[PDB]
Amino acid sequence: TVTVGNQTIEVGKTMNPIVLTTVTNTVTGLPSGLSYDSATNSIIGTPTKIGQSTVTVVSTDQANNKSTTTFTINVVDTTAPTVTPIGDQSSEVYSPISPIKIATQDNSGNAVTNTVTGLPSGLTFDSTNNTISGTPTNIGTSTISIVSTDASGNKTTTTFKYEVT
Amino acid sequence: TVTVGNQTIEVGKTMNPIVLTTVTNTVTGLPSGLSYDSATNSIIGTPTKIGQSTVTVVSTDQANNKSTTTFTINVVDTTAPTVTPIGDQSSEVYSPISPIKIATQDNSGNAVTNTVTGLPSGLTFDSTNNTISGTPTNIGTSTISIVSTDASGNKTTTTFKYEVT
Ligand SMILES: [Ca+2]
Ligand SMILES: [Ca+2]
Numbered sequence: 001t002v003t004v005g006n007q008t009i010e011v012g013k014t015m016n017p018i019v020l021t022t023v024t025n026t027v028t029g030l031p032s033g034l035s036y037d038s039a040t041n042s043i044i045g046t047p048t049k050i051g052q053s054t055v056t057v058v059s060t061d062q063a064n065n066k067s068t069t070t071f072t073i074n075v076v077d078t079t080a081p082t083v084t085p086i087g088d089q090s091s092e093v094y095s096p097i098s099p100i101k102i103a104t105q106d107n108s109g110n111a112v113t114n115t116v117t118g119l120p121s122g123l124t125f126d127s128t129n130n131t132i133s134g135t136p137t138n139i140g141t142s143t144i145s146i147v148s149t150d151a152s153g154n155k156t157t158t159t160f161k162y163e164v165t
Numbered sequence: 166t167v168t169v170g171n172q173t174i175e176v177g178k179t180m181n182p183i184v185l186t187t188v189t190n191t192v193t194g195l196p197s198g199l200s201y202d203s204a205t206n207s208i209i210g211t212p213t214k215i216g217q218s219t220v221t222v223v224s225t226d227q228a229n230n231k232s233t234t235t236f237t238i239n240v241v242d243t244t245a246p247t248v249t250p251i252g253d254q255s256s257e258v259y260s261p262i263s264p265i266k267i268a269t270q271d272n273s274g275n276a277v278t279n280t281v282t283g284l285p286s287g288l289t290f291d292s293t294n295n296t297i298s299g300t301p302t303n304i305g306t307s308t309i310s311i312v313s314t315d316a317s318g319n320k321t322t323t324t325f326k327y328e329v330t
Contacts, residue, residue, distance in 0.1 A: 002172065003168055004186065067237050069235060069237070
């Protein structure tokens with residue numbers, strides 16, 4: 001058997017090393033974030049860009065006899081964004097609130113979209129600065145729900161209670 | 166692990182099929198004598214030329230997503246020549262013999278060298294037509310020894326008795 005197909009790895013995570021097995025290997029075309037460890041004949045590191053790369057191994061044996069393999073690594077994003085926790089909130093009706101920042105992070109290098117719902121009346125969400133602000137118009141309790149989506153469509157849902165008094 | 170190095174196979178023999186495993190594979194650069202069996206995702210056949218070939222698999226999955234592996238096949242000769250059997254011989258001293266042809270065959274496409282020794286006196290070997298002829302000058306028994314060598318240095322030894330009466 002010869003192994004064909006993608007070698008699939010997760011962007012922004014430290015990969016399981018890929019062992020090269022049958023000698024001197026010469027590896028090229030590696031994505032940023034990865035390189036080749038002679039001493040373990042392993043490709044290791046953490047890839048930073050989503051996409052496919054075609055990697056070339058030229059191997060030389062003890063008599064300097066040349067050989068060539070190439071294969072594809074596929075760097076994917078299948079992990080959801082993270083969101084800094086937001087505690088339960090309380091403020092007085094008719095008073096402008098201190099803005100609440102939704103801080104998000106993602107294993108991809110990239111921007112995250114937040115969809116916010118269940119907001120107390122009078123309050124609003126600004127997608128440019130990703131903050132909740134405004135002036136509550138009703139007393140009562142709300143559950144504020146945030147769906148954060150990375151560029152590859154992975155979603156996280158975060159909730160917190162808003163209490164207006 | 167990714168498999169690196171030569172895939173080594175024997176010239177003029179029917180290979181163990183190489184299974185391609187992880188889909189539509191597109192195979193190219195195969196040596197003469199081999200091709201790709203879709204239904205088994207196997208490379209099969211019998212190679213005829215000694216040497217290295219670099220073979221390319223482009224695989225397409227169910228969503229038509231492209232992938233690439235390449236590897237080297239190394240077609241070697243490690244098998245000795247064969248020689249048509251020659252029976253024990255008898256002829257009269259002072260009489261020219263009917264020439265004896267040494268017929269050889271080899272799994273490589275190529276020429277074989279025969280080294281002949283232990284010949285009864287008066288007899289000789291012609292390397293161009295590969296035949297023993299001449300006129301025996303002594304009565305007695307000889308053991309005639311033939312070393313046949315292929316182009317890769319694989320050797321077979323064949324013997325037969327010559328009786329001069
Ligand atoms: Ca992600
Ligand atoms: Ca041979």
